[PDB]
Design a protein around this ligand. Structure first.
Ligand SMILES: [Zn+2]
Ligand SMILES: [Zn+2]
Ligand SMILES: [Zn+2]
Ligand SMILES: [Zn+2]
Ligand SMILES: [Zn+2]
Ligand SMILES: [Zn+2]
Ligand SMILES: [Zn+2]
Ligand SMILES: [Zn+2]
Ligand SMILES: [Zn+2]
Lengths: 123, 123, 123
């Protein structure tokens, strides 16, 4: 909950970068013309954004594996089950990440959140 | 002298609200587009504004009661003295408030000061 | 490294004044419309600016005294050596100041630096 570089409170959320920063960070050239908000005023927006993204991926994952289960119930179908495992990997990691961000604190929720958003957009 | 919500120093005076706030308060949506100044740079303006308002009300109160004393010196004049007591109430409370704001600290002086101004304007 | 007036960290450099100030200083009327930067982001600019200024004055001083040495090697030439001592005084003090600013910390480097710049410009 503290900026390791400046030793100040991490309480500002930059919309350009999706990072949680301190007031001295806000002055640096990195965020010269960036719009910041209080962490306490963007949490709900992103929390609901990740909740829906988690739900839609859980549904897509449930559909995928119920199908993958029928194949495995027949047993080279083995290589097909291997493909499904490799294709759905990034979803399993993303689902895990969102479950961590939602259950945890506001720091874990928002830091680099916009990066997790764009990864969700990819699938 | 501290913001109970954010634990920061109350050193900023918002002109839109007439409140003494902290730097994190200044970031919240409550003061999205409000002009703030240092508490130490608006005290004199408001101090003299309240001094004159106190003086003009003390004079109006002195005139009123000297008149109210003549009536009571006759003794239903009793109900007339009761009316005067009810009519001049808000002035007695305002005079008291200003005496508290002027004698005390800068916090008591400026917090919600603009609210006391508009009440002074009413009479 | 602390603002004696406000007790806050001296981490902001005002370009209009050439002073190192705190965030409460930045709010005062003194710097109403001044551009500030992080001390950590202007040090290099001024450090190199003073390095070149020191070098050019050391060279001008070396040339001057080697000439002053020839005169003193003859010995009223004494009054001429006295004039040289009085003429080159401000350079000897400026050279000393720059050597102090460059060797020391960022505070000593930048505080009132722009004042030392204009004195360097005079010669
Ligand atoms: Zn920082
Ligand atoms: Zn940024
Ligand atoms: Zn599968
Ligand atoms: Zn506050
Ligand atoms: Zn306000
Ligand atoms: Zn009366
Ligand atoms: Zn200061
Ligand atoms: Zn300035
Ligand atoms: Zn000489």
């Amino acid at each position: 909950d503290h900026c390791a570089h400046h030793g100040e409170k991490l309480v500002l959320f930059c919309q350009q970068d999706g990072n949680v920063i301190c007031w001295l960070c806000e002055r640096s050239q990195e965020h010269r013309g960036h719009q910041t908000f209080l962490v306490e005023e963007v949490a709900q927006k992103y929390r609901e954004k990740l909740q829906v993204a988690l739900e839609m991926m859980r549904q897509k994952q449930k559909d995928a594996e119920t199908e993958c289960n029928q194949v495995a119930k027949r047993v080279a179908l083995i290589a097909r089950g291997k493909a499904c495992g490799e294709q759905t990997q990034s979803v399993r990691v993303l689902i895990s990440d969102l479950e961590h961000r939602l259950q945890g604190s506001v720091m874990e929720l928002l830091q680099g959140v916009d990066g997790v958003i764009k990864r969700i957009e990819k699938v």
